[PDB]
A paper describes a structure:
Like all members of the Picornaviridae family, HRVs consist of a T = 1 (pseudo T = 3) icosahedral capsid of about 30 nm in diameter that is built from 60 copies of each of 4 coat proteins VP1, VP2, VP3, and VP4, protecting a plus-sense single-stranded RNA genome. In [name], a member of the minor group HRVs, upon binding to lipoprotein receptors (LDL-R) on the cell surface virions are taken up into vesicles and directed to early endosomes. The low pH conditions found in the endosome, and not the binding to LDL-R, catalyze the delivery of the viral genome. After release of the RNA, empty capsids (B-particles) sedimenting at 80S appear and polyprotein synthesis commences.
Here we report the 3.0 Å resolution crystal structure of the [name] empty particle. Analysis of the electron density confirmed the absence of VP4, as predicted from comparison with the poliovirus uncoating scenario and the cryo-EM structure of [name] previously determined at 15 Å. Externalization of N-terminal residues of VP1 in the empty capsid is compatible with the lack of ordered electron density up to position 1062 (VP1, VP2 and VP3 proteins are numbered starting with 1000, 2000 and 3000 respectively). Thus, the rearrangement of VP1 in the 80S empty capsid with respect to the native virion can be explained by a hinge-type movement, consisting in an approximately 5.6° outward rotation of one of these two regions with respect to the other. However, in the 80S particle these subunits are displaced with regard to the VP1 ß-barrel by between 4 and 6 Å towards the icosahedral three-fold axis. In the structure of the 80S particle, the density within the pocket is absent and the cavity appears collapsed. Surprisingly, the 80S empty particle possesses pores or breaks crossing the capsid shell. These pores, absent in the [name] native virions, connect the canyon floor with the internal surface of the particle, close to residues Arg1062-Glu1068. Altogether, these changes disrupt 13 interactions of the native capsid and produce a break in the interface between pentamers that crosses the capsid along the two-fold symmetry axes.
Author numbering:
A (entry chain 2): 14 to 261
B (entry chain 3): 1 to 237
C (entry chain 1), E (entry chain 1), G (entry chain 1): 62 to 283
D (entry chain 3), F (entry chain 3): 1 to 60
């Protein structure tokens, strides 16, 4: 089947065998939890549609990829603008990861959505991760062997340590889904807003972090020996506050 | 006023006591609580989450995602026995898994564990694996036959990429010590009932994953300090 | 499963800080006072336990265990003043700073032979929970990881007596106990040594990454 | 008489405590209270009073 | 708004007076006793808070924190006598004055190793409230500002022991706490340094008037 | 708070006393009890059991 | 028959262990800490009483009686730390081992002039009772007699103070009391001297077997 949401519509979503992060469905901020007493209203279905990032290439040597939300969507039409022209904001998402392969391809991905995924820096000593590298945008972050710049600002490349000192394989404690090519070829996660406060500065704080690690290497005898992984994200109950003048 | 008699123990500071104490900020009204998704109330919640077992914990794959999978062959000359692991929650490789880690934080455990397997092969790759459990007391099987003579499962991969089997609780005492035993521990052995069968133009090998979690009856008692984490560093601020 | 409740796992008391104070003769004020920013991340064992969750909320119980040691010349009777400075309030920077007599702060006086001091603190943050992890940045886009809402205040201590001071050492073990605990979003357990406070950094110089996973020669033999 | 167990914290003087204490002048009956206009009960009362902002805070 | 109640704002305890007493060998009586006229206007911080209102009424809680310091020669055990002399009653003027044994006064004996002394005082004035300000004069038309009905009595202290006296220093911090507080007629907050007790005087010699108002270069830029 | 008067004997440790004491392992839930045959509840039970008398207690 | 109840016979408190600790100057850590594996079989009188049954179950009450002795140079004020390490938990092996500040263990601090420390322990075994006797073997088929489920933990003690240490001796009598006692399968009373712990061995080298039976010259004369 196909999930048409807004002016966007993604085919191949099918049935609803997706995971709902922590069992809580994305909801609008209730007045009881609200920060400034209550706001008259915040109903806007304008930012609620599907933004499909460029498909990443999964090769026989791919070690992993990760994106951070809301960061990844900072440049996605309405949502992007909204979060740029507002001081505070909160949002849930419906991440949809799917890859095209055949019955002659084999491989497995772990698609996990990690809350407050605080990355660890690459080097030893008194170093820390720099702003630019945890905010790669929709491009995401690919695990590479090549040497990079402001090295002491760079985050770790140890994917098997979840990029934060924990063991991959325990990463299943977070809302996730496995993508076993011979069984399924897509996964879906519906996550609500998660933070210790009602809303926040989307610019400085990334609530969720989408991680994708190939637990079982991709193998195939096809001419081109790589397949694409397509990611579609859709904001859920997005709300904003402290709007500022735009086009100024 | 009121005649009182002081009891042995008064004025002592027992680190495990439970008494009231004056509030240092009696007037301060703490920030209200809001609804944060995912509240945990019992560690058992964490123990019932399947986590990958570093089944292939050899020096070759030690610090890579390859330590979590076993490679199945399609060639007729691969040894019948694939892999083997002890069933005690605290023994390697289980130790470093979710349930293993939480278990290492206690001294007594009890209950059944649930092993799940996932075939990371191709959609046209088929095979029959023999998953067998060996109760504590006897040494792990050495031949496919011995293995199937005990409790086991002939899992036919084609058409079902997953399967789970429950290891029961077999013990003299109700709870057993959290520390790994050899003669008091069970075994999970995996055998080739048939090798990997595949059509033409297909990867000759496929990976196998292994998960583990506790059941409803799983439980821990008498907390101690985990030994899976030894801190001998600065922790400089 | 009662002993597997958060209250049982995190609610146990542990020594979160060791505070040593030594009598110095040169200047009366000197740096005789001791100031410590409350932080439960200083002890690895305690840290790993809490870092098992993303967000936690709880009240606190501080217990103080003073250990006086007199090298010589008696000086047996001395009065100690332990003070708690709330988040945001100015901390003392001299043994006679005004902070020590301020009423917005909480102080407890202890003279040897007295029961160990003890008091409680309510949930201090301006947020609804303490952040065990923070995928965010500072307002200056720096010092990413640490959260400002997480501030819990400071524990201060000064010797109150005057001249009876004969160069004596004071050890004060600070025991903290999380009460009425609540936690959210469990995370995998820390697998490597900690290297920094408020950072998940794990890489150590000239040393190989070492996990808890023990390797075996062959996988067919358990 | 009655078995008691002393709790950690006894005898301490917590500057923010709240306990009763013997009256030093138990017999003295304090002057009656009269109606003085303008009783304040909460500081919020003071905060809701408009006051001039030194908007032109320059050296001049 | 519970923490913004008068009880919360003024009802906190603070050190209203530091009282030092030193053993003097020349004469037994000497001036070993110490007398202090209770006054909550001595500490600027505490003063400014109360001076936020015109009239206040409340009961009091006095807590005493004795700090003994022995230079040498032991003398460890000494008995202290703190005495409260009501408004209008004669104050002692010798360490052995009769006042010390009078029954109309209140005394509390403290020997080291004992819980800190503490007692309560009811609203003392002959008027219905204490004057924080007074646009009036004396009966002699002098000493304008101060109010006689505001008298709260005196806190006295003497070393009771006799010859075990080996020149030891005694520090006694006096903590006061306003209970069941009531206030009338709010006034603007004090904007300048205090210079006199019982006077709103603010002009200081050879120094410019300095407010809390910070100046900026231009008003178009915040 | 509540006026109390300490009685002679307080703080003493009488080896035959009977007072409560804080549990050092308050969270630990002890192993359940099972039915073991032969529970003894009173020593009189042992005294009512005939036993042989060493009637011929000579050196031989 | 109330005094003939198990509670009366086994429920009495007795000194199960004497623990001596001496201040040693060479190294701060040294072996200043003392560790003792709880065992009620060390005292013959107490042992024979319990060995009157095959299986017993009960809770415990530990009371500590510290005896400090100062050879010279004062050092009057010292703080003691007694710690209970549960069965299976790692025991300390240095005066500054981490075990001393761990929260899974139970510790009680005692400074002279304080009431004797005291705390309770629940039934510790993983079995439903403690074995007074065991006709079984180890997993290695060795050390027959002793039972592993019978482990009760360890009592540890360390001097907490630092340099005020002037070579002073510390004696700590440990009193234990079985509460809520239950026993199963009565056995004949021990008739010979004990020679080993956890073994019914009775043969002593170069000494004849001696019973409580007193011999008489002729059986016709009582």
């Amino acid at each position: 089947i196909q999930i048409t949401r807004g002016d966007s519509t993604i085919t191949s979503q099918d049935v609803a065998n997706a995971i709902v992060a922590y069992g809580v469905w994305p909801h609008y901020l209730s007045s009881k939890d609200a920060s400034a007493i209550d706001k008259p209203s915040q109903p806007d279905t304008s930012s609620n549609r599907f933004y499909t990032l460029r498909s990443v290439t999964w090769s026989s040597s791919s070690k992993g990829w990760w994106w951070k939300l809301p960061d990844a969507l900072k440049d996605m039409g309405i949502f992007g603008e909204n979060m740029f022209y507002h001081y505070l904001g909160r949002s849930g998402y419906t991440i949809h990861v799917q890859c095209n392969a055949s019955k002659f391809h084999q491989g497995t991905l772990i698609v996990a959505l990690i809350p407050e995924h605080q990355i660890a820096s690459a080097l030893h000593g008194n170093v820390n991760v720099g702003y630019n590298y945890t905010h790669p945008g929709e491009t995401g972050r690919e695990v590479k062997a090549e040497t990079r710049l402001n090295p002491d600002l760079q985050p770790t490349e140890e994917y098997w340590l979840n990029f934060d000192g924990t063991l991959l394989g325990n990463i299943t404690i977070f809302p996730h889904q496995f993508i076993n090519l011979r069984s399924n070829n897509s996964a879906t996660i519906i996550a609500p807003y998660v933070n210790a406060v009602p809303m926040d500065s989307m610019r400085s704080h990334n609530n969720w972090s989408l991680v994708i690690i190939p637990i079982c290497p991709l193998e195939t005898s096809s001419a081109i020996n790589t397949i694409p992984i397509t990611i579609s994200i859709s904001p859920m109950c997005a709300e904003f506050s402290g709007a500022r003048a735009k086009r100024q | 006023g009121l005649p009182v008699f002081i009891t042995p123990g008064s004025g002592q500071f027992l680190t495990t006591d439970d008494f009231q104490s004056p509030c240092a900020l009696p007037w301060y009204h703490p920030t209200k609580e809001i609804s944060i998704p995912g509240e945990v109330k019992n560690l058992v919640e964490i123990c019932q989450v399947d986590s990958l077992v570093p089944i292939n914990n050899t020096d070759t794959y030690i610090n890579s995602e390859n330590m979590y999978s076993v490679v199945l062959q399609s060639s007729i000359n691969a040894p019948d026995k694939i892999f083997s692991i002890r069933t005690d929650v605290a023994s390697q490789p289980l130790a470093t898994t979710l349930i293993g880690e939480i278990s290492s934080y206690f001294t007594h455990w009890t209950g059944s564990l649930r092993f799940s397997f996932m075939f990371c092969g191709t959609a046209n790759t088929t095979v029959k694996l023999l998953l067998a459990y060996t109760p504590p007391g006897i040494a792990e099987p050495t031949t496919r036959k011995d293995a199937m003579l005990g409790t086991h499962v002939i899992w036919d991969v084609g058409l079902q990429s997953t399967i789970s089997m429950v290891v029961p609780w077999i013990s003299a005492s109700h709870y057993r010590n959290t520390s790994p035993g050899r003669s008091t521990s069970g075994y999970i052995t995996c055998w080739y009932q048939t090798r990997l069968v595949i059509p033409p133009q297909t990867p000759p090998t496929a990976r196998l994953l292994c998960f583990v979690s506790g059941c409803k009856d799983f439980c821990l008692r008498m907390a101690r300090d985990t030994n899976l984490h030894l801190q001998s560093g600065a922790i400089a601020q | 499963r009662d002993e597997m409740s958060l209250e049982s796992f995190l609610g146990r008391s542990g020594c979160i800080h060791e505070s040593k104070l030594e009598v110095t003769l040169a200047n009366y004020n000197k740096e005789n006072f001791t100031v410590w920013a409350i932080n439960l991340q200083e002890m690895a064992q305690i840290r790993r336990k809490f870092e098992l969750f993303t967000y936690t909320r709880f009240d606190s119980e501080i217990t103080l265990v003073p250990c006086i040691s007199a090298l010589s010349q008696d000086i047996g009777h001395i009065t100690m003043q332990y003070m708690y400075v709330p988040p945001g309030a100015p901390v003392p920077n001299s043994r006679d700073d005004y902070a020590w007599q301020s009423g917005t702060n909480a102080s407890v006086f202890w003279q040897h032979g007295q029961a160990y001091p003890r008091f409680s603190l309510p949930f201090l943050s301006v947020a609804s929970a303490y952040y065990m992890f923070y995928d965010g940045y500072d307002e200056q886009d720096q010092n990413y990881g640490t959260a400002n809402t997480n501030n819990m205040g400071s524990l201060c201590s000064r010797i109150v007596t005057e001249k009876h001071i004969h160069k004596v050492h004071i050890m004060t073990r600070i025991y903290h106990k999380a009460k009425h605990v609540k936690a959210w979003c469990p995370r995998p357990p820390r697998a490597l040594e900690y290297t920094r406070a408020h950072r998940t950094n794990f890489k150590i110089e000239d040393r190989s990454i070492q996990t808890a996973i023990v390797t075996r020669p062959i996988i067919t033999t358990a």
